Every structure is written in C-alpha cells, then in structure tokens.
Amino acid sequence: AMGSMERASLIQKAKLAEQAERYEDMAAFMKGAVEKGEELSCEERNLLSVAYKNVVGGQRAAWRVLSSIEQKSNGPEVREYREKVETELQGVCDTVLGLLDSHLIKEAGDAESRVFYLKMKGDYYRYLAEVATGDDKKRIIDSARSAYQEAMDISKKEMPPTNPIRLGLALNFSVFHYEIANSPEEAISLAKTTFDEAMADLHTLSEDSYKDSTLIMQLLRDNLTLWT
C-alpha cells in the first residue's frame, strides 16, 4: 500500500507519526520502508520496533481488560469482543514476524542487527503465547524460546555485557521465563547474572554509554525485586 512512496519519505513520515503519537500510521510507514527490500540502519530498526511495540501494546492492554471481564463473567458479547481484539493482535504479530522472515533476518549479518531482529522475533512470539490456548500453544512458546536463545548465543559471543541490545534481550528473555515458560528460577538466575556481568564492565564506558546501560540494569533490578 506504500509502494508508491519513496523509502526516505516513509522514514520521514514515520518520525513525524511518532511525534504525533500516531503509532498505527508509524507502523504502516515502517512496514512500507521494510518492503522496499533494503536493509535497515540502526535508527530505522528502532523506528520499526517502537511503532509496532506501541501498536501491540495497546492491543495487549485491551485484551487483558477484556480477558479479566470475561473471567469474572464465568451473553456472548464479552467473549466475542475479546476474540475480535485477540485476532487483531495476532494479525499484528504475524505481520511483524512476516517482515522478519521476509527478509530482515536472513540479510542481517552484523551482530547488532541479527540480535535485534531475533529479539524481536522472540518478543512477538511471546505476545502470541500470551493469548494462546490451543494445540499450538506449546509450539508458539518453543518458537519464542528458540529465537531468544539464538539471539543470546550471538550476543554472548559478539557483544560486551553492557551492550544495551544484549541487556534488553536478557531482560525480555527473563520475562519470558517468568511469565510464559513457568520458569521463575531461570528468570531470576538470568536477570542476576546479566546484572552482575554488566556491573563489572561499566568501568569501560563513557558517561553517555554508562547512562544507557545503567538504565536497563535498573529494569533488571526492578524485576528481581518483584520476583524475590
């Protein structure tokens, strides 16, 4: 649908849509930019991720409200409307996963891009897992786990322990363990080891990098405080 707009204009409009808090537009512009077929720069990857995180975040919040009302009730309207929102959410997750599979991951050869996209793949399978209840729930969970694990393996070989992408990947994989995989001890161990290894590498960083890394380390600590 964005095929007639220049790549650079789609990127410019995605930035304007972010300023205007028009995240559905932002996601459509960034989908159009991906579909031009060129690899994404670091800033463009961040625009893609922010756009879809906001879209799916609103859907997840609505699904949780409706799911809570439905569980309290147990006419067809609450279930029907929860199902409508759930289908829309699944459609957005499938769209993101489709962009990653056609063809962002296969062309991503640098550690920073490949880890970023595999973390995204884990995240969007995780959002699918949050609403899954059928015969594929196990397979959806395994798909999230596999994507996160490949990203972790690359990040540990190629990035320092303070790298913000590495830290955010570990944070989200720990949330996967706690919330999806019923593995709270694995979640706590991963968050603790990630935090401690980052702490020991802070001395290597500039003031600005220190700020970036310590911000995410505080999120790991916040989860550890809630989980212990």
Binding site: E18, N46, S49, V50, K53, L171, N172, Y178
Partner: peptide
C-alpha cells in the same frame, strides 16, 4: 514484570 518498554525512539 517489566519487559523493555520500547515505546519511545
């Protein structure tokens, strides 16, 4: 609990 909020570029 909290994943990366991820909602501001």
């Amino acid at each position: 609990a909290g994943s990366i909020p991820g909602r501001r570029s």
